Structure formats: structure tokens, C-alpha cells
Amino acid sequence: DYALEKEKVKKFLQEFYQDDELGKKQFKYGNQLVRLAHREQVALYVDLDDVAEDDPELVDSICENARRYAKLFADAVQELLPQYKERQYPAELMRRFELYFQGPSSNKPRVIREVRADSVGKLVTVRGIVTRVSEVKPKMVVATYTCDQCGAETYQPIGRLYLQTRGSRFIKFQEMKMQEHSDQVPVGNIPRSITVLVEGENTRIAQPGDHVSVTGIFLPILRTGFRQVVQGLLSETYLEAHRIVKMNKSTREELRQIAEEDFYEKLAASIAPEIYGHEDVKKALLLLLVGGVDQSPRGMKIRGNINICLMGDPGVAKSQLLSYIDRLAPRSQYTTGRGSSGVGLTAAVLRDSVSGELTLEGGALVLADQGVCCIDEFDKMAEADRTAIHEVMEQQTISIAKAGILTTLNA
Amino acid sequence: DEDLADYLYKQPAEHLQLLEEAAKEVADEVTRPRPSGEEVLQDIQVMQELHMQLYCDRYLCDKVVPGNRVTIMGIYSPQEEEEFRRLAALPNVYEVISKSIAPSIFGGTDMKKAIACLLFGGSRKRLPDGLTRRGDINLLMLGDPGTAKSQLLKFVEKCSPIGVYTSGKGSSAAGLTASVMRDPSSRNFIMEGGAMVLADGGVVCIDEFDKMREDDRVAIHEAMEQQTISIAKAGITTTLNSRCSVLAAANSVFEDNIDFMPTILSRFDMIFLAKLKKFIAYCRVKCGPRLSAEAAEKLKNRYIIMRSGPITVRQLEAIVRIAEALSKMKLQPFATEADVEEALRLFQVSTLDAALSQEDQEMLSRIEKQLKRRFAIGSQVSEHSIIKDFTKQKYPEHAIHKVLQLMLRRGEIQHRMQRKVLYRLK
Amino acid sequence: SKVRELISDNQYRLIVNVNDLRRKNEKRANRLLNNAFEELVAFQRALKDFVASIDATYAKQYEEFYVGLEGSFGSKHVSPRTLTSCFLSCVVCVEGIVTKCSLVRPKVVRSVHEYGLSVYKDHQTITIQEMPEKAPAGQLPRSVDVILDDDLVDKAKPGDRVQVVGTYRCLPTFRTVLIACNVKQMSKDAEDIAKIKKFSKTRSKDIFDQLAKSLAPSIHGHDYVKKAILCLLLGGVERDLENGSHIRGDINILLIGDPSVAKSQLLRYVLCTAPRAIPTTGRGSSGVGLTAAVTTDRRLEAGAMVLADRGVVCIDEFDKMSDMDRTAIHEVMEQGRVTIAKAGIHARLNARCSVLAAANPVYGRYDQYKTPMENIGLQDSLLSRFDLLFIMLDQMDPEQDREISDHVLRMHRYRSAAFMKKYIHVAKIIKPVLTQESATYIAEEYSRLRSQDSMPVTARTLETLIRLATAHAKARMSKTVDLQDAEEAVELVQYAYF
Description:
3 chains; A: alpha/beta; 10 helices; elongated; MCM5_C (chain B)
């Protein structure tokens, strides 16, 4: 069905921009098309839900073949330009003009562990927690090369030859690391985290720690290379994040009989079970288990921080509860005094192999954007780790003053 | 038989192919049920240097180590006792035993006389519960060279039928013990062996034992203690007999004076023709001697006299080997207190050698004086400089290694900090 | 019906025992030739005839209809050491140790060797050396790793010793693996019994005061630590730590002294008597308790504290270790799981491993003066973390030293071991569960001792005292604790305090 219905999708794409009046006497998707040829918007996203209402083909099918129905979404868009155009690959061939995807919950944001051999070629979305923010670069995609004896532009994606930028096809890209939410891991496992493939205007966009959107999805630029999916030498499908988007925001005693009685009486008697009493402490833990993050507009930005210290470690095996706390506490991470460097909390940088130059990846604090920060042995966090602490006093406090990087991250 | 023997010698590779086929022909004609349960073949199959490569694969892969009791299972493309009995009868044989062994170019009688004990050694004790025990006392020969200790060790070496002269700071990839390595083809094994390896049961002339490689050093400490080492790889149960004996030759360095193990000089004793090869063997082959209890009485008494004096405990042990040499010098069932007392006269010297004649309690004080009470971070107090302050404080490189660079062994906070602060700062 | 129970909404793979296996015919999923390559695909294609009768939805080529072929196997049932080309392309009921594991990925579209023609496959190999704990006193392996197919991948984890049957995945020279077929955990799935029931009577004798000596054959003194050595030899492998955890009874012990102060020997005895026990000394340079994430291969060279899972170790020269090995032990002692996460190997692999530890009087010989917390410099918390910290002090006791060399020599030979090992197995699966009265007696005297040693930890000390009473009653094969079993522990912990 896939390799030879090229006319349909082109016919389809010839009509889907025409399939409504929502782009002002044009469909919304066509709203961008005049904006595309005029270079008003250059990248595109796609709400695939609008197609399944009349044709789940290219919806279930792209869900079966992201690449092809990615790649085939393009090759129509390739020859669709002259229909809206205000004026191998000719030079302009979507050269700075890009396509992304979106739509129903058939592509629910999946788990970093749940990438699969099934996830190859898959339509792919993810949420989770961010880190490993690389130094962006530009990045060529096509060696617009020279047939010097012959003159005009020549394109390879790849001896006496030169490979020359003036017509070549480039992009701004990064590496990223999505991480599990610390919420869907009530488990004896590592909260997994992923090498992410990151590109487009969805680079230079966001910080670590965010709970976010993704679409980890193949580019239309190639199906497999010269032929179908079967090949002999192949680098990795990792997470080709399209439409990375923040998550600002995703038992009643009125219908039930629950919040009526004092949690500040009751919640003690149902939290800290092993604990040998001293629920008094637990209250603040309860308070911190409430936190104070979601503020009313009185500028109380310090409301979020319940900044407690407990003094002395085989206190009941109070060593234990922080796991209990983290067993309670999502958005939560545990660390120890002398277990690692400040990047147990903070962040630091060096080269990587896969993609992206010098990914800043960060610690618990960098992981704990409005989280719950849990420590062993605060004393051994010697002067180095005494410090961003003493900044993290001040909320968004992972500040840098280094040659190439001088940011702060939102501790 | 007749139709195979001479043929099989020059032409093994086919006339025996008839046999196992003839065996398969008989085994089939033995007319059991004939499924492919061929693994019990190697049951009904019954019914390197002493290099060479030998048939070590599918049935043959990984059976034993080399140089063993050479049972060559395949083919690759008395009246002298009577003298020795007279020597065993002979009273002052001990000294010609001491001195017929001796180029009198050099050497205290005691020093040789260790060797005169050494070749007889202790015993190999298949004792009471699982665990066995040594039987062979070891010697650590330090001091100045200019001795022909080479010739001496070579004396032992070309005395030793079991025993090889070893080197140095290693050589090739055989250890002083069971080093191994990777066949490029699948890295099945490289039984590189060691110096005790070819000499297991013999004696090892370890040249510059101090200068050996650290690779075996972590290993040698035990098989020297244990006379066997374990291959500590992934799933290798094998632990190899390191039952060779010692000729641990190095220079007086610089049990305080080891690279990183000043107790391992525990593992030795205190050193600062083919007639024999017939002699010593038979009693090395026989004896199975013991110790007279009446000496054990004096021993227990003596050690109480020495406890009025681990050193003692292992000295207990070392004596228990030394006088055990004498019964083998004497073909005895057990050893008399004269042996012990002589062995004490042997060992008391070695103890006086063990003597040399203060604790480290002066050190950590003055170092903790220096480490934080002078300066925690150690800046300006660094081993670029404080070395001189150690040269002032008479704490040599060995001693700061004995203390300072093992104050980090103590988990010393500002020091191990300093080990990284002045890793580059000084 | 015998083929309709296969839920292929779920994982298509099945478990199959041999008794129902022989009942079918060719092309109806039997196995009677043991000619797997035809017998498997024919089984699957028989299943593909069964599913097409059950659900044509379930009849899909991307679904492989695989199986483990688990039950009553035997004729092939051996170890990697013992898995030879007589089984070449045969299904062997592999028992072994999952220690030295591999690195992960999907595989690529296996095309030469529906999301496109040739999708990746969730896959890696995983190592199996032969089952060591019954293995030779000394012997090299010819072992192998083993393929984990998609649904089987990440099922079990390194360090297990397991019951896994599958197909001797040889290549043509002579290089192989298995493809598991399926795992069962022998690690989960487990004659003189009545004799032990005769031996183990309280009418028989006090085994405890005996047996500590009946395996301490060559030790004058330390009769406390023998019982400790027994106690650490004793103990279960599970605490009902619901929704949390605490100090536990697998906790591990430290000792002070030289060998010939019995150090190595005790360990050697603990080693000679190490059933479910591996040792070390100090540094133990071979990924001590780690997988080590082994380069350009990648392997998981799962260390002792993986290899020691459901075990107890001996440490000699505990001081020797790296600070990281000083460190990571500290918590993984607590966790009992090996927090590893470099570029690649992320896990907290279980560390169900006790230890006995020994190390040196630092720069002493005597080293009496100070708290081992700096007397012996492996300083802080580890010691408080440890079960116990006894010192075989080098106190001249001439009246004993008189005896000691005699005590040397009654063993010199001028001219009951396995009995423990057969005792201990039966003990190791019992639970001497609580008694109020003992518990009263425990709860009686903790506070006393806690008060007595005033002139030491409630959240902890009780829990070892718990375990300490356990080993007593466990050695008794009793099913609930005796108030005397609860007693000697108080004496024992008192003997820690003397």
C-alpha cells in the first residue's frame, strides 16, 4: 500500500489544505502554506487528528510507517510548493522549511524504558525529565558539492571534489536527555533516561528538569537510504524529538469522606509506620510533602522551599525515611554527602560521542526543579558542595561563570 | 598391536583412525541401543616445556597445567641409599652437608645451613580437617651484592633438579606465579605460569624479588603464604599449587621495608653435588617425619622463654619446620630437642637478624601536627617541599610512604584532601 | 483441548512440559526427535496451525510463537562447563550462574542473519559460567553466554544461579551460545534429614556451644567469635521488610588481628567451610562487587557482591580497599544492592551478601589505644554499619600461650565438617519465628544492656540480637525462639562488651 500510493497523498495533501475554510478561505494547514512560501513560518507541525476524522489512512498508516508517511508527507510538500509558491533536489527544496507532527492520544508520551524493537520506525512521543543540554551547532545535511568542470549546483548527502556550503542544506541541532519523571518508577529500578536526537527550532528552547512533550520521530528526509528498511550498515534510531513542549501543568470529602478529618492528626497515624513516633517531625515532612510550591500572586517565591535539616544519622535509622520520603516524594531525589561531586546536585560539562558538544547535565538539584531535595550526610558536602547549596538558598541558583557556559539553571 | 606400533609412531594419524572406527564398529557390533549419547565415549574411551603446543581442545581442553608428571597421552606432529644411609648414620655429616655444598668464597655456616635445611625443608601436611600446611621455610636474601649470589642461586639451581632461576622485574609474561593472557584466537587460555610454576615443589631463585611486578604482588602474598594461588578471573575455579620453595633474592631495599607489605618479610627467614640430588631426594621422597614431643615440651617451654622474650607464633611455626629439616637430614621418625635447640641456634641468629638490635607513634603525631595543626589544605606544606621538612624530620620517602602516603590509608581527611589539593597546587 | 490456553494477546511464548509434549503428532507441536531446527519451527508452525484455529488474529509471522520447553528435562541437563558438542544444536537444561553479563540493545533488522521488512529485535546475550557452588576445588571452564530474546530480555538479572533450558546455539571453529529458551530461577526454585532430626535433638546435646568448636578446630580462645563465626555462618536470606527496610540479619562482621592470630585461617576455615561463600582479601582487583561495564566487548563482570548474593564473604585486609570500595560498600551494605550507573550499566543489583571482615592493627601490632574508628582508620560509620567488630587482641596470656603451642601440637599429629554443611542447609530455610516471651526477654534486657553499657542502638542492635537469637534457634532447627536462644545473644553482645 505504501510505496505506490504517491498520487493519493499528493492528491490528499493537494486537498487537505483545501479541506476547510479554517485558514481564512483555506484550511489551517494551508494557512501556513502561504506563510511558508512567503517565509513567514518555516517549520511545520501536524495535528494528525484532523486527518483521521475523514481518513485514518496516513494516521494509522503513518503510525505503522512513520518514516514513509514522514518521507511521503515531504515529497508531496516538495512538489506542492509551486501551487502556493509566490515566485535531485532543486536548491530551495524545503531547505530551511520543516515539518513536525502531533495529534491524538494514539501516540501517548511513552516511557524511556519502553522504547523497543517495535519502536523502530515508530511514531513516537514521550514525556519525562530533561537534561544533557548540549552546545548547539548548525549542522549541514546535504553536501551541495561541485562538479567544477560542469558548473551549476550538485548535491550529495555525502575526491579532488570540494564540498561547499553555498547551496547545502543545514540545520541547528542539539543533544538532549529526557529522563523518567521520578513518578512512574515506584520501583527497585533506575529512573531511566535517554540519549535524545534534537533538532530544528526545537533547539535553543528549554532547560533540563522540565516535564515536557516530545515526538521522537524520524525525519522525512530519508526512508532508509536508496531502498527500503532492510540495509547492511545503519546507525541508531535514537529519539528524534519533534514537538518538544513543556508541561507547565498537566477523593473529596464532599463525594467521599476523606479530607474532613485532620490529616495533621490523621496523616501522621497513616504515615511513617515503622517510625517510632516522633510524628512531630513528620509534620514538617508532611508540610514538605505538601510543600508550598503553587503560590498565590503575593510574590512569595520562597514559599516553595521547606528547607529542613535533621541532625545525627542512625537516629532511628532516619537514614531510612528519606527513601520513605522519596517513596512518598515524586519530583524527588536522594543524595549523600561524599557520594559524588556537586554534580550529584549541580551540573558539569564534557564531550560526548553520539551527538551534541559538551552536554551540561546536572544533579539532583538540577534534577529537582521545585522538587524534594534529600540528603545524606550534609556535612560531607565539603566546601564545594556547601556552596551552590548556599546559593540554592536563593532558588534558581545553579549559576555558571565558566569560559563557554555562564548560565543559571532553575534549582 | 603388532600391526600398529611402529606405524603409529611415525604414522599415528590414520592407523589409530582405524581403531576408534573399529571401536565404533565394535561398539555398534556390541549392539547396545545406539542413540547419539556420545558423551560417555570419553568414559568408554578408557574401556609445554616438559615449549610445545599439544592437543588442548574438545576432550582435551583445560585438563591440567604443564610440566606435570608427564604422562604423554598422545603424539604431536639403593646401593646409593646405603651410602646415603651411612651419611644418615654419619654424625658430622651436617657440616660437610653445610660445607661440601659450600664454595667457601664467602658465607657464614648458619647462612648456608639454612640452605642445608632448605633443601630438606619442612613437610607437606595433609592435616586433620580439609586445610593442609606448608613443610618448607623460606629465606629472604638481602644485603649488598658482590657475592656471586647468582652463582649461589645457580649453585642451588644447578643443584636443584626441581627449580629454575627466575628474574628480575619479570620477563615475557610468565609470573613468579600463574600469570595468564589471551590467545588471539578466542583467548581460551594462556597458561603463562610463573617461577614457582616450573619449580613447584622445587625452589625459586627470585632475583630482585622487590623489583617484581605489582601484578603478581597482590597475588603472590597469599600463595607465598599458601603455596597456592587462585586464578581470580570470571569463573575459573582453578587455584594453582605454588608449592615451590623460596630463594627470594633482592637487595636490601632503601618487616618495615616492603614496597607495600611490611609483614610479608614474615613469609621467609632472615638472610642478610649431584651426590646431593641422589641424597636429598629420597628423604625428600620419604621421611614423613614428625617432632619429638619432649622437644615440643622444651619448645612450649622455650617459647614461654621466648614469650618472656605473630613473630613468635610464626617463629613457632618456622622452628617447627627447621628442626623438621633435620629429621630429614637424619631420616628420623621425629626430631629431638637438639634439632630444635640447634634450630634455635639457627633461628636465634635469624632472630638476632630479625632483631637489627621506637614506634610510629612519633610519626602520626608530628604529621597530624603538620597535616592540620600546621595546615589542613597543606598549601606551602607540599611534597614538593615538605619532603625537605621530612628530610628535616628524618621521615624518608619509604617512611612517608610508610606513613604519609598511607595516612591516606587511614582515611585521613585533610591529608587525602591534600593528596588532591596539592595533587597540582603544592 | 490442549492448545487453546495460549494467550497471544499476551506474549506468544509458552511454557511446555515433556509429559504433554509427547502426546502430539508431527505438525501438532510435539518433540520426539529432539531435532530442534525442524522440531521447533514445526512446533511453532504447528502452533501457527493451532492459533489460526484459535485466532487468526494470533496468526502473525512477526509473532514467532516461541517456547521455552521447560519441564522434566535431564538427558540434557548440565552446566556450561559440561555443555559440549554432543549437545551441538540440542536443548540443554542449563544450570549455571548468571554472572558475567552483557551489554544491551535491540538488534538491527535481522534480514540476512509492519514497521518495515526487518525491524530490530530486543536482544542481548547473557553469560553463564557453570554453577560454581558445586564446582571443582579447581578447574577452568569452557563456558558460554546465552541469548535473551525479546520477551526474555531483562527477565532475570546478574548473579543469579538459575534453571534455564534451551538450544545449544552453536555456530559451525566450534563457537556457540545458547538461546535460553526460558529461564526459571533455580535461584528461586529449590537423606540425613531424619538423621539430622535425630542428631538435632535438644536431648542430643547443645550443638551450639559444641559446633562453634567443632568447626574451630585449631583455635585457642575466640570461643565467642566461633559462635559469631557460626552465627554469621548462620542466618536467613529474607526479612519481611514491607514497604521499606531497616538493619537486617544478613549483617556482616569485622575482626582485628594477624593470620596466625587465626585471621586468614578463620577465614580459611570460613572459606574451607564456605558454602554459599566466596571470599576476598582487601582490594580484590577484579571488579570487587561490580559489573564494571566492560569495554569493547560490553560485559558486566559482576563482582563478588553480585557473586555473593544470598551469601557471605570473607574480607581480609579490609583496610586495603579503595576509598570507593571503602565507600560503595558502605551503603550497599545498607541497601544490599549495588548502585551502579555509568554510561551504560545503570542498576542497583542486589547485594544479598553478608561478610566477615578482617584487617590489620594499622601501624600497630597491638593497636589497643583508640577507637577503630581511627585505630584501624577505615574510620567512620562502616564500623557502626557492621555487624560486629571483635578484636583478637595480641594480649600475652602465658597460661594460654603455654597451652597454645600444645594446642598447636595436638593438631600437629605427633602421630564433623560436612555434618555442619548438612546441618546448615536444613537450618537455612527455617524461620524461628517470634515469641512474646522471648520477645519479652529480649525487650526486657535490651534496655538493660543499653543501660548497662551506658556506664548501642535501638533501631539496630535489637535487630542483630534478633538475628543472634535466630542463629541459636536456627542451629537448633527450632521453629520458634527459646528464651535461652534469646539469652546467649545478650551474652554474645555482652561478650562484645565483655
